[PDB]
Design a protein around this nucleic acid. Sequence first.
DNA 1: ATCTCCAAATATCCCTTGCGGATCGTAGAAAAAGTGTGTCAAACTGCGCTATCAAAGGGAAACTTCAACTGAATTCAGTTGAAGTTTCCCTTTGATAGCGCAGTTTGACACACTTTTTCTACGATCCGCAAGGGATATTTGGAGAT
DNA 2: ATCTCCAAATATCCCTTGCGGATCGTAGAAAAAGTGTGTCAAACTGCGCTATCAAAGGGAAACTTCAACTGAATTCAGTTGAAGTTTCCCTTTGATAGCGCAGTTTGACACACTTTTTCTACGATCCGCAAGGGATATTTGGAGAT
Lengths: 99, 94, 103, 105, 98, 97, 83, 78
Amino acid sequence: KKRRKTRKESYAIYVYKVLKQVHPDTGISSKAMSIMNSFVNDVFERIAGEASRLAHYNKRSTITSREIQTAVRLLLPGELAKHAVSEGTKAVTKYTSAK
Amino acid sequence: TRKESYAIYVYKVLKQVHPDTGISSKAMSIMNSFVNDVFERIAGEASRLAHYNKRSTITSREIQTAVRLLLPGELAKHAVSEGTKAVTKYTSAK
Amino acid sequence: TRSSRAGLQFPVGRVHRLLRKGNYAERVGAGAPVYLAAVLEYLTAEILELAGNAARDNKKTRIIPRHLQLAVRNDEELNKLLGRVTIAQGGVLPNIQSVLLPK
Amino acid sequence: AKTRSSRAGLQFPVGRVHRLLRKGNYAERVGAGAPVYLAAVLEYLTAEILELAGNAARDNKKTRIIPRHLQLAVRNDEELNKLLGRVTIAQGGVLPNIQSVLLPK
Amino acid sequence: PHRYRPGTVALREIRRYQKSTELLIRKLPFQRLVREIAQDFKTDLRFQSSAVMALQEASEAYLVALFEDTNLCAIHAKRVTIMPKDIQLARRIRGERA
Amino acid sequence: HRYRPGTVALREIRRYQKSTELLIRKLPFQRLVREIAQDFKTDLRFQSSAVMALQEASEAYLVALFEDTNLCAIHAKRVTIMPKDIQLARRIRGERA
Amino acid sequence: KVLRDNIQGITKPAIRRLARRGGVKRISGLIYEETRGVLKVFLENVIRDAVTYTEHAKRKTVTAMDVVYALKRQGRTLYGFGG
Amino acid sequence: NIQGITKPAIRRLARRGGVKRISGLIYEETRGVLKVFLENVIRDAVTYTEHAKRKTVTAMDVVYALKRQGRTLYGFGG
DNA sequence: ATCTCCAAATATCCCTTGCGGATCGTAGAAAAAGTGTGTCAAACTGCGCTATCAAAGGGAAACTTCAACTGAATTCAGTTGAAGTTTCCCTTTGATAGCGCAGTTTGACACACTTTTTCTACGATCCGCAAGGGATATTTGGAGAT
DNA sequence: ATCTCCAAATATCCCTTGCGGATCGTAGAAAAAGTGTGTCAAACTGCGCTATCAAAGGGAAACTTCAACTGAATTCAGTTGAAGTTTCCCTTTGATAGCGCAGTTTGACACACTTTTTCTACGATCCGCAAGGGATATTTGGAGAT
Ligand SMILES: [Cl-]
Ligand SMILES: [Cl-]
Ligand SMILES: [Cl-]
Ligand SMILES: [Cl-]
Ligand SMILES: [Mn+2]
Ligand SMILES: [Mn+2]
Ligand SMILES: [Mn+2]
Ligand SMILES: [Mn+2]
Ligand SMILES: [Mn+2]
Ligand SMILES: [Mn+2]
């Protein structure tokens, strides 16, 4: 103890879960996981950067699910966007229900 | 409402450089775009640099290495020296 | 956890922390990290779904970089989204221009 | 000297740049010298373009600078052209340029 | 009656247009095309006049630069006549798609 | 027995378009990087993964560039890539003036 | 009234002028439709983003800034109309 | 060192690119093009290294530089 | 060579517009002044991991031999795009009447955030074991010669 | 077309190691709480965007003529690819030497926030006046023709 070797932090586990939900009998190498972690960080940054600009453009001090949504429409191509807006909208609907 | 612009400053720097030359409305709009653009590109990179190095503040240092990363070689040497020269003089006051 | 309340596998709390530390805006609404976490999840689900089949077609139970590269490049939209990205150890889609082939 | 620009020996507004950096969410804190340096760099770049566009205007026997002048200035300069390699100047047109093979023989 | 050889007027046309900066596409037609395309994305949209101006400035600069590259592709193929495949080669290398 | 010119080359294309192995020898590539780095800052070390990052990026770049260069060659009724082809690809890419 | 076939308003002579400014001396008759197609894809991508900024601002009037912000997004910054 | 990137090495690279026939002057062009590429990336990477007051060029330093040049790389810390 | 002659350039009168220099009242922001408050430079410190040493082989790089076939050059002609003419379509210009709607304004308050205690998901670390590596064999898909 | 030879794909089986499921401690997400301001709605509005038109005429469309560009066809010097000999150095294995990256702790002070005072800079309205772009006639550079 005392001097703890820092502490990284990735999406590796949430990734692995998703891999199970779609490919129960499929595994993943350490290198491919690194690629998946980059992808997630990359997408996150791209989406928030837009929402941030949307917020600024419209002189608003807050990033809501509305800026996340149209940021998604600007960043993602056709079909991927339509679906993504489906999952996001659904998550928000469900999440608010849960009390 | 009010509408900010770099116009007055641009006129100023223009007179120091070409005392008997004017600039048209559209050309000024372009100049104003240029300034807002370079600012965006510089502040933006400085922002990343600070984040990359877990810093909470953007200093003249992050602005400096952002200038070296963004400007083509030469335009950067001069910007860097006008920048360093301005901060040196400024700190020399108060 | 907010994820559960939202039916997501992805960390809604973490995403919320990251949205506040990235200096994107003075404030972050409550639904923003949920919506973003869902999207992130969908997209990684989408990739793994296709990379998996690439692993299958190549007869491997383990997804490797090369499989993620095939999934991405054989998919029009993912290829567009990652048009400026290079997947290390991904190689390229086998492709020889017709006129180069022997009759 | 009252204004910070005055202190820095600058034409560009140090005060406005400091505020713009603060209202742009680039970082939680902005140092005292950040806007002086940034204002000095922005002042320098516009001096460089006004200078070159200014010369282009005199070449076209002109006293006033218009978009075309800024375009000729930018594209005839290797550094500015690269800095604005992905920018388009409205009403700038292009540089006079005809590939050789197309010339009469 | 007088007759310039084919290509002589072509050359002075290149010099005339390379000297100027005015939009080359008729204004109203461009505006209609813009409104037709927007309308397929959303209905009941209105445009500021400058918003259309901006679109036209961007479109013409885009096309003018595509033609320059297209010409380089034609010349690379030892031709002097731009062809559909020259534009296609140009957009493929530029990473432009669709 | 002799395979006709092109036949082995075609074979090689299939082989490499099926693997993901780096194609430049490692040690040589590492020296180049240090020599270049050295010209911008003396006394510099490199994390082993840094050098490898540069190689992954360097090769993905050359490979894609050859794809562009090859199309230009083919655009000119040729099957042999040449400098003019690499040069035309970079000019259109915007990599060159 | 319904809007149709306006890509035709982009006439042959107008496309020809564009090719001149771009230094082209000889044009194949098949170029005009190739250009209309390309221009269409171009306006579609930009306008699609311009309209997304409009809808987000809860506006009905596409502004010069939505266009400017859209062009910037596509890596095609425009000087002269704001921002 | 530039010669370390050998002719056969450049051939394999061009093969992945799908090249079937290679003029003899390609090898020198590629070396010149690779040098400019590395110079640009390494230049930016080393700028990050110095700004962090470090003497060791990190993978992240390279990845940030590759992201600045519009060549985002996945696999080393994105 | 030497002349005819088409379109860009040059030159004169007219006038309206956009620009540099003013002069003015002022909303709103920069500066000056007080003081909380946490970020960060220093400073000694531990160990991860980068650089480096030394000997050997094996396979990759380099050099050599030979000629297959690809790139470049020459000749030629149906094709097709440029130049010029004629007609008249519908863009451009200019004033307009009407309202859709962008944008300022003002009080209610839902909602994000700060501070703190508690509860817990996820990171650092482990090791068996099976997917993948890797070596030798049998099969399968094609190229090249007869 | 069909037949002999090469190399890739495929089957087989034993070794290597990184996947992936466990364990344990904890940094961080969550919960209940007390606080205020950015956001949303409702009411007011005039810039300007849409629809429209009326006369002018600039520019698009369509057709005839034919100059000359594209590209099919043929040719052959030689640059390249394939395969074999020769020369070289990248890759791999067992670790010390110690550089310098990163963890810890900390308090001066640089920067945030607030309130009052000073003043810059923008919107509205006037001016000397050369810059300037159009209506209209003449000179000029040189492409094309006698
Ligand atoms: Cl929200
Ligand atoms: Cl500072
Ligand atoms: Cl074609
Ligand atoms: Cl060449
Ligand atoms: Mn429609
Ligand atoms: Mn058998
Ligand atoms: Mn693991
Ligand atoms: Mn006419
Ligand atoms: Mn030390
Ligand atoms: Mn004469």
